[PDB]
C-alpha cells in the first residue's frame, strides 16, 4: 500500500543528495526539469543552502517507482550538526550510504554507519562516483569490508572504462555466507549441489530483514550508469510499509521547520491509522488539536492531500507542536539517541549588534530553538551574554548565515566567561571596630578569615558565644558574609574561604540584625584587602581517543597545551589517553584533535578540581557589585 522510507548517509560530503536528485529525475517526469549541475532544485528548499554549496538541514521529497511510494531524505552528512540526521533515523526505516572512492568509506561516514547499527534498521552500500580516476575497483571495496566489520558482499560487479555492469554478477560459489549463517540456508548448503540464485535469495531476504549485511551497489550517478537499477533494488529490497488503517491513529513528530512564508511546518509520520482532514486529534500536551491543513512535499512542488496514508510522512501546520510529541497517544519504539557526543561543542559568545536590535536578535535565537532540536542557549551571565550549545565549525557558519538571511542580526564572540574563582592567600585578623568611630551601623564584628584547602568551598564557625552572637543575629552575619562572597576585590567569586568570626560588640537599643548584616560585608572586604588573594581556575580532565599511529603526534599537542600528561592505554587499533587541561585553553583542544587526527579524532571531558592557579598578572573579570545599600560605605572604606 504505502512505501518504505529511504535514508541518505552521505558521510564526509558524499554528495549522495545529488544522487537523490538524479533519482528524482529517473523517477520522473512526466513534467520536470530533470535537475542540473550544482543547485539546482532537488528539494533544496531554503535559501543559503544551495547558495552555500551544501544543505543546511535534511530535506524531504515524495517519489514513486515500480508502482510504489519512495520517500527519501538528504543529506545532513555535512559537518557538523549531524544530530538532525540522527533525528532522521526515527523518520525512516531504510538507509543508503554513499561510499566514497577515496580509500573506501569516509571515516566520518563510519560514525553514522555505526549509529545506523545502533538504529537496528536495514541499509545498503552504494559505490558512488564510479566514473572517476583512482576508483577502487578492487581496493576501495576491500576498505569497505575491513571498515564495515560485517559480512557485506557485492550484488553486482563492474569496472571501467565506459562499462556499467550491474545484474551480471554475482558471488558464484564463494558468495552465500549470509545464507551459511541461517540454519535453513546452512542446511541447504549442507545438502550440497548448485542451486538457483533466488533460493539463496530467500535466506538473503531473511538476513536482510535483520540487516545482517549491507546489499552490494556500484556505479556513479554522473555517468548515468547503475543509478537506475540500484533504485529498483531500493524499491524491491526495501521492507514493506506497515499498512493497516485498523486504528486508532497514532504517531509522532520527527522534525519541524520555520519557513519564511510558513511561518512554521511540523513534519509528522503516521505510525498507525490515518488522520481525516479538518478533524480533531490527540496531543502530548493533553489538549485537542485539529488538523487544519497538511500536504505531501513533492520534489517538484508541494501538494495538498485530503488525508495521510498509514506509514506516510507529511508536514502539517499547527498552533503548537513540541519535538517528538505524541500524535496518538501513543507510538511505542525503542532506539538509542546521541548528539555528536557532547553537552556543548565549545560554546561561543553571541552579543547582538546595536543597542536595541540585539534584543530582537535573542528572539531570532528563539527562532533557532524552533528549528533543529540539537541546540540550546541561556543567559547564564549577569550581563545576559548568550552561550550557544551548538558546536562545530561549519555549523556556526550555518547559524550565522541563517542569522544573516531570515533575520537581521549578527554577533562575533567565542571567549565567553573565564569562570575564574579567587581564593584567600593567607589568614589575617580584621575588625570593623566598635560603636561609631566610625560608620553605620553601630553593630560590628571581628572577622578572622583563614586559608583553606582547594575545593573546600566556603566555611565558617560561630566562635562567638551567646547571646552576643544572638540566636537570630549571627545568622545575618553569615548571610552577609555570603553577600561578601559574591565578589572579591578583583571581582572574582570567593572560594576556599574560612571565615571564623570572633569579636561581636553591639549596643542593644540601636542594634539590629540588618545592621550587623551590613557590617559583615565590610569585614569580608576588609579581610580580602589583607589576604592578598590568589587566582583559581578550572582544570577538568580530558579523555581522548585517537589512532595509535597519530598518537605520537598527539603527544606534540601536549607541549602546545597547558594540560599535563596523564595515564592512557591502547584499545585495539585505537589508542586512548587521560588528559587534564584548564577550561580556558580546552576549547582549542577540540580543534587540535580535529586537525591532528585528520577528522579521525575523538574526545570527551568534564569539569573538575577548582584548585589550579594561573598566570600571569592575575587578571580578573569585572565586576561586583551594585543595586544594594551600603556599597557607598564600602567605597568610603577604601580611603
Amino acid at each position: 500500500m504505502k512505501i518504505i522510507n529511504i535514508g541518505v548517509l552521505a558521510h564526509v560530503d558524499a554528495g549522495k543528495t545529488t544522487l537523490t536528485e538524479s533519482l528524482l529525475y529517473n523517477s520522473g517526469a512526466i513534467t520536470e526539469l530533470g535537475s542540473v549541475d550544482k543547485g539546482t532544485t532537488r528539494t533544496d528548499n531554503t535559501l543559503l543552502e544551495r547558495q552555500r554549496g551544501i544543505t543546511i538541514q535534511t530535506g524531504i521529497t515524495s517519489f514513486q517507482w515500480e508502482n510504489t511510494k519512495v520517500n527519501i531524505i538528504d543529506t545532513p552528512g555535512h559537518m557538523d550538526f549531524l544530530a538532525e540526521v540522527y533525528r532522521s533515523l526515527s523518520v525512516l526505516d531504510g538507509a543508503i550510504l554513499l561510499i566514497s572512492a577515496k580509500d573506501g568509506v569516509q571515516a566520518q561516514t563510519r560514525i553514522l554507519f555505526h549509529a545506523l547499527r545502533k538504529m537496528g534498521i536495514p541499509t545498503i552500500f552504494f559505490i558512488n562516483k564510479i566514473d572517476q580516476n583512482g576508483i577502487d575497483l578492487s581496493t576501495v571495496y576491500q576498505d569497505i569490508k575491513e571498515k564495515l566489520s560485517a559480512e557485506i558482499v557485492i550484488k553486482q560487479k563492474v569496472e571501467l572504462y565506459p562499462n556499467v555492469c550491474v545484474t551480471n554478477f554475482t558471488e558464484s560459489e564463494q558468495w552465500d555466507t549470509v545464507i551459511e549463517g541461517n540454519d535453513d540456508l546452512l542446511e541447504k548448503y549442507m545438502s550440497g549441489k548448485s542451486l538457483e540464485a533466488l533460493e539463496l535469495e530467500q535466506e538473503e531476504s531473511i538476513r536482510f530483514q535483520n540487516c545482517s549485511l549491507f546489499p552490494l551497489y556500484h556505479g556513479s550517478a554522473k555517468s548515468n550508469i547503475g543509478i537506475d537499477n540500484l533504485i529498483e533494488v531500493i524499491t524491491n529490497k526495501f521492507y514493506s510499509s506497515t499498512h493497516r488503517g485498523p486504528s486508532e491513529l497514532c504517531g509522532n513528530v520527527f522534525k519541524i521547520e520555520y519557513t519564511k512564508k510558513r511561518q512554521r511546518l511540523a513534519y509528522i509520520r503516521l505510525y498507525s491509522g490515518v488522520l481525516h482532514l479538518r478533524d480533531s486529534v490527540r496531543v502530548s500536551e493533553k489538549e485537542k488539536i485539529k488538523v487544519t491543513e497538511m500536504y505531501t512535499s513533492i520534489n517538484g512542488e508541494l501538494c495538498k492531500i485530503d488525508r495521510a496514508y498509514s506509514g506516510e510522512i507529511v508536514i502539517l501546520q499547527n498552533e503548537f507542536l513540541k519535538l517528538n510529541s505524541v500524535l496518538g497517544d501513543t507510538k511505542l519504539l525503542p532506539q538509542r539517541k546521541k548528539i555528536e557526543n557532547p553537552h556543548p561543542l565549545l560554546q561561543t559568545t553571541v552579543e547582538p549588534s546595536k543597542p536595541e536590535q540585539r534584543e530582537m536578535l535573542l528572539d531570532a535565537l528563539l527562532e533557532i530553538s524552533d528549528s533543529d532540536p540539537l541546540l540550546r542557549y541561556y543567559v547564564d551571565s549577569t550581563t545576559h551574554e548568550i552561550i550557544l550549545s551548538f558546536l562545530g565549525k561549519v555549523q556556526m557558519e550555518v547559524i550565522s548565515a541563517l542569522l544573516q538571511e531570515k533575520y537581521h542580526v549578527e554577533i562575533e564572540i567565542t571567549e565567553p566567561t573565564v569562570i575564574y574563582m579567587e581564593r584567600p592567600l593567607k589568614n589575617a585578623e580584621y575588625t570593623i571596630h566598635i560603636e561609631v568611630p566610625p560608620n553605620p551601623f553601630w553593630a560590628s564584628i571581628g572577622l578572622s578569615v583563614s586559608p583553606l584547602p582547594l575545593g573546600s568551598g566556603m566555611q565558617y564557625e560561630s566562635s562567638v558565644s551567646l547571646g552576643y552572637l544572638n540566636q537570630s543575629f549571627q545568622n545575618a552575619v553569615m548571610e552577609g558574609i555570603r553577600y561578601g562572597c559574591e565578589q572579591g576585590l578583583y571581582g572574582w567569586n570567593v572560594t576556599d574561604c574560612k571565615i571564623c568570626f570572633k569579636y561581636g560588640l553591639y549596643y542593644s537599643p540601636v542594634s539590629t540584625p540588618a545592621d550587623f548584616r551590613m557590617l559583615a560585608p565590610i569585614v569580608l572586604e576588609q579581610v580580602l584587602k589583607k589576604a592578598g588573594t590568589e587566582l583559581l581556575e578550572p582544570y577538568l580532565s580530558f579523555k581522548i581517543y585517537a589512532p595509535q599511529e597519530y598518537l605520537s603526534r598527539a603527544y606534540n599537542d601536549a607541549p602546545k597545551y597547558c594540560a599535563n600528561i596523564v595515564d592512557t592505554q591502547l584499545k585495539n587499533n585505537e589508542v586512548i589517553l587521560s588528559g587534564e587541561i584548564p577550561a580556558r585553553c580546552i576549547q582549542e583542544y577540540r580543534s587540535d584533535l580535529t586537525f591532528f587526527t585528520n577528522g579521525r579524532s575523538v574526545c570527551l571531558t568534564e569539569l573538575k578540581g577548582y584548585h589550579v592557579t594561573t598566570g600571569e598578572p592575575v587578571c580578573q573579570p569585572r565586576r561586583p557589585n551594585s543595586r544594594i545599600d551600603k556599597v557607598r560605605y564600602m567605597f568610603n572604606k577604601i580611603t
Binding site: 558464484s172 564463494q174 555466507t177
Partner: protein, 69 residues
C-alpha cells in the same frame, strides 16, 4: 610443535565440519565448501599440537574422520 591436520571424511556432518573449517581458517563459505568437497583436504599445516587436537576433537564431536601427521 608442528602438527598437520588433514581432513579425510567430513562424515555425516558436513555442516559442523564446514563450521570447523572456516572457523579454523576463515575462508569464504564457498571456498570451505569446495575444500571439503575436494577431500581429502589439508586443514592446517605446522600448527601447535594443542590447536591440532582442539579441532580434531571438534571433528570427532561432530563425527568426522580426521588425520594427524
Amino acid at each position: 610443535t608442528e602438527f598437520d591436520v588433514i581432513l579425510k571424511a567430513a562424515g555425516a556432518n558436513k555442516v559442523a565440519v564446514i563450521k570447523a573449517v572456516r572457523g579454523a581458517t576463515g575462508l569464504g563459505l564457498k571456498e570451505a565448501k569446495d575444500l571439503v568437497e575436494s577431500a581429502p583436504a589439508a586443514l592446517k599445516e605446522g600448527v601447535s599440537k594443542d590447536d591440532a587436537e582442539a579441532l580434531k576433537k571438534a571433528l570427532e564431536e561432530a563425527g568426522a574422520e580426521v588425520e594427524v601427521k
